[PDB]
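Box 3.1. Reading complex inputs
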Amino acid sequence: FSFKKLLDQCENQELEAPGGIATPPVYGQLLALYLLHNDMNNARYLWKRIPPAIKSANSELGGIWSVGQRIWQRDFPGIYTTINAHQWSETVQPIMEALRDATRRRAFALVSQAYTSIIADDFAAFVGLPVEEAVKGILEQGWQADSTTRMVLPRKPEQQLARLTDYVAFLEN
Amino acid sequence: SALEQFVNSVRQLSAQGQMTQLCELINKSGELLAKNLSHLDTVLGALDVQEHSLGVLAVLFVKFSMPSVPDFETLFSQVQLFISTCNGEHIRYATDTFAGLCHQLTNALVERKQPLRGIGILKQAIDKMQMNTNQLTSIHADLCQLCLLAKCFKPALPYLDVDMMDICKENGAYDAKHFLCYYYYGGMIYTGLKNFERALYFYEQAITTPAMAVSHIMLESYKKYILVSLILLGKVQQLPKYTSQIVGRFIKPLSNAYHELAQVYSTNNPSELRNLVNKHSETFTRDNNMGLVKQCLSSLYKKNIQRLTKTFLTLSLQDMASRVQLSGPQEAEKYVLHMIEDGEIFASINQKDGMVSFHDNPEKYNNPAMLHNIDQEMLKCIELDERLKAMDQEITVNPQFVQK
Amino acid sequence: DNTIHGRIDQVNQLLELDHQKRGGARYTALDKWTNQLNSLNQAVVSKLA
Amino acid sequence: EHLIAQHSAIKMLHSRVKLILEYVKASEAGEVPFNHEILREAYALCHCLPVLSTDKFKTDFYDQCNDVGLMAYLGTITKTCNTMNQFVNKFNVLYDRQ
Amino acid sequence: KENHNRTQQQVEAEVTNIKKTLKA
Amino acid sequence: GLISARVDSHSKILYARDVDQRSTTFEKSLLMGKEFQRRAKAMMLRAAVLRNQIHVKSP
């Protein structure tokens, strides 16, 4: 969509724009946008190469590498709790508004084939909703819950003729 | 005084041919060339700079001291502008001082600890010095180190995903150090991004270099080769037949901790592996690959769990976390869930009964999308055969290959 | 003693007889071809030592 | 030479479907007496398409396609191995120092 | 097919010419 | 490779499994193709280094 273009723009402004060190705005923007695309391998090195002067001056970046560890050591309640802890200017607010949706869709896709019967209490922590609100919204998708025990059962949801001629012309030379 | 004759000569000898004598008179040096030439550099660059600027800058940069003294910012700007807009195919007549200039820039940046500015410079120098994109140059070993000392692994990815088929001679020079360093640093970069399948290949292409003496860039390409092979596969892969015998004579005995680690990672038992990591903790941390070893310990569990799929159709979580020695059904649940999420295993958890059911039924080859996979794999072989024929006909017509 | 071509099912008290014969000669030939190419390729490559 | 044997049979089916279409259009606009039988058989012929688009068909068809694709893949691997051997033999003549 | 055999015949002609001029 | 069976340790039932010839053939053929391409690339690089005569001297 539009986030990939922003990502490559910050990559270019990190490489060739500065005299070795870029501005904290683009630094934090890139750090937070790496997490959205699930690229923790690059994000760890981005945090490791940050000079130890932006970290001690612009402390907000230290906040962003507080969501990341939660993705690193996979912990969905940790992700949801840490996202709702800090706040910055209008540079990461739409980043951590699509990160929320991405994480909540990742959890839904995770408990759709890994689990065939899961407690509703654990499902609420996975998706990131209150248990009562989670169970009622589950039933629309067709997943059959089971009350009085809280055991939701997730349920699974033009040139060929040219190519063959190209293969024949190659085999026979 | 005299330089005015030299400056004018390059002005008139160039733009009319006579390119053979140009490199001859450039090689005549000038005995420090009256190092105050910083003023004449800009005027000499008629049209798209020139070639004599390379000769001036090569001498300027390697005064074996005070690069150009504190003129660094100006020197760096001159180098950057020159490399960005040198243009012309003339820059390929002297791929002996161009590589030297890039190497000197890399060494200065590494010494000054700013290996991020040069990643953008040695990206046009590579692009504007090789014939095609499948040719290995001595500069490829500089970018792969600049983007490794300054953790920025993604810029080097376009230059590591090409299967090289030719190596630039560079009109002399190009010692084996550059070839070994490129295929070692590329392996390190690929390992850092957790692409082990190609990191193993890159390390292997450095071990099998022809050799007659032990070099301390092939030792730390066998030590890491063992670990990457133990992570990606369950065992140490067999090195190719044409491997130099030096690896099997001195390199192997020098790496004895890693062979012991593989020996323990041959009988599946994490208890001994955890002890061996600590007993040899000095060797594994002196070689700096401590952290690539703990990945082997963490991968032993993931290998054992996958080995459970070949015998069982439904296992209990408490019972499962007693053969792989995970010590707890709660931790075995997350160990299985992580492996399912990564596409390493095919299983489903049942928290009600608390049991893991193994499916073992990924795919039946009746998909119109698998046809795409077969088509791509066939096209890659077709292109490979075309390349082989192309660089076979160039030998069939060689005048030397008619007398023998 | 190779007299009944079937298998018993103890938990269901059944007897499942073998009646279907898929193509077993084409896939065996393809396996032999693949296994022989896997060795021919190595023999060809090792000549460039 | 194989595609021409299938180019002379499609050219016969096309030159009949075209004639039937021309007759149907002539009957519509009005050029020949309205014959009910012909215009009913033409309706049945039109209703006969597609020919057997069931779900089991597009698994056997793809089975066959994938089997032939794998056979073609192995054929190209064999030809590339032959070219490999030819190049290696031609190379270990010039660049031989033993 | 025509292009491949033209290329093969041209390579053969070049090799024959090289063989002929080699007799010097 | 003595018994082609799978244990079901819930009702304690030993099931007999049957290998799919077609899927096994496809898997092993694709793996062979991947290895062949890897070896081809390695050999081409070996030819380049042998042609350029790249080696490390004892000095």
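In summary: The longest helix of chain D spans residues 57-94.
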